[PDB]
Amino acid sequence: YEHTAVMPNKVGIPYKALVERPGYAPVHLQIQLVNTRIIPSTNLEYITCKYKTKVPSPVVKCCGATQCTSKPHPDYQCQVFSGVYPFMWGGAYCFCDTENTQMSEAYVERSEECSIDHAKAYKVHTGTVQAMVNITYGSVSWRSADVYVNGETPAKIGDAKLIIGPLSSAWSPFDNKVVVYGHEVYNYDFPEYGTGKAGSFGDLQSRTSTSNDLYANTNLKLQRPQAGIVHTPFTQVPSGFERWKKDKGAPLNDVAPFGCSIALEPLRAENCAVGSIPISIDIPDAAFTRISETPTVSDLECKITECTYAFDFGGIATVAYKSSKAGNCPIHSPSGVAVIKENDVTLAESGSFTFHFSTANIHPAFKLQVCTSAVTCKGDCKPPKDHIVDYPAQHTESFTSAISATAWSWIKVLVGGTSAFIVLGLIATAVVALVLFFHRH
Amino acid sequence: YEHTAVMPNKVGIPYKALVERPGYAPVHLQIQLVNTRIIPSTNLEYITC
């Protein structure tokens, strides 16, 4: 038997339902989620790290001049300085006074720390969604298996085939372009490998972690060596990756709404709570019993001894039955006013059992069924003493769940008697037309 | 759990109350005084004999 219904996209809260099959006793079906992963499809554009400009040794022409060729190198710079006349250890180096040439060639490469700390630039394209569901029905125990959240894939868990329906919203926390640095991800824009502003983020872009190609602008500029010493001095703007690591916002795993935990190695977005998930589970008939197998119950009276407003299970009710024989049949509340903590019960010959519930109403008006026989429960509830707790809400909050009986009666005379007061005023007009018409004849 | 009330200022008469924690059984409570001493602050000025 198939069972198709809808489910809120929650992790901790189970989904309790009863399957109504004609000619068979109803069975208890419980669905619980464990994880909920949103996995986009990403492609790496480039990586970024701090640079390191190595300077080769210069040639010191003693009497003459040289030139240089445009060597293929990232941010390669060249100049020629004349009349240097350098001094080394042990006297001067050249002989021609005020007629010399120093090379001073510089070149930019990536650092040796680039294999450890780097930022990877990704482009996010919408991908797949998968989750993990816990399955139990009847007397079969809890078991779990991974499913795929789409509209097509059948997942066989246990003996039943479950199709998890698609999400009701395509909301994803990721932007078009994300950057991954170490443990956390960010929503940051890129210079897109063609640009780089020499001090901001893309002053060293390499297409992969070991690429021979390397784009790097760093505003490198060679300066003149001074006073007769041999060195190559340069001048460049500082690192844009180093500047990014200080002037940096909050990561996406501290900013993302709906409680989206963000993991790394397939770049998922775990345990978001948005939308609804439809289901379709084909329960086998081997877990179904006939009407003659189950014991019928009668003479049901339910009394709520104590109720509390909090979203712990703070409502206790005792109900006395009169069954035909001993047995075990599940209980369930179909309405959304109350959820029920236990599923089955130990029946006897005209006993009484207690069940724990958790509502969000001042006056609950739910009903529950035991061995396909209904009984209505009602009572009053008190507010809880606590202000802040560490566990989420087991129930659900409706529009009319906060209205007490005194305030419900107060609005029943401000729209009940007042709207009926215009009925008195309208019929006085309707009879003054009749009493004036009768004056003529 | 915290329970607040008002007891009278009598010595031998015990105060009885029933605390009501929700979800739990009530617990009897009994507070009784033994002494009640008012101690003013004094400073000696002189003695006489």
Curated annotation (Swiss-Prot), chain A:
Disulfide-bonded cysteines: C49-C114, C62-C94, C63-C96, C68-C78, C260-C272, C302-C377, C307-C381, C329-C371
Q: Which sequence ranges are marked TM in the entry?
A: 418-438
Q: Where in the cell is it found?
A: Virion membrane; Host cell membrane
User: Which stretches face the Cytoplasmic side?
Assistant: 439-441
The way this protein sits in the membrane is described as: Single-pass type I membrane protein
Description of post-translational modifications: N-glycosylated.
Question: Extracellular side of the membrane: what ranges?
Answer: 1-417
Task: Identify the stretch(es) annotated as E1 fusion peptide loop.
Answer: 84-101
What functional role does this protein have?
Class II viral fusion protein. Fusion activity is inactive as long as E1 is bound to E2 in mature virion. After virus attachment to target cell and endocytosis, acidification of the endosome would induce dissociation of E1/E2 heterodimer and concomitant trimerization of the E1 subunits. This E1 trimer is fusion active, and promotes release of viral nucleocapsid in cytoplasm after endosome and viral membrane fusion. Efficient fusion requires the presence of cholesterol and sphingolipid in the target membrane.
Give the protein name, as stated in the record: Spike glycoprotein E1
Q: State the species of origin.
A: Eastern equine encephalitis virus (strain Florida 91-469) (EEEV)
Q: Which residues of the full protein are shown?
A: 802 to 1242 of 1242
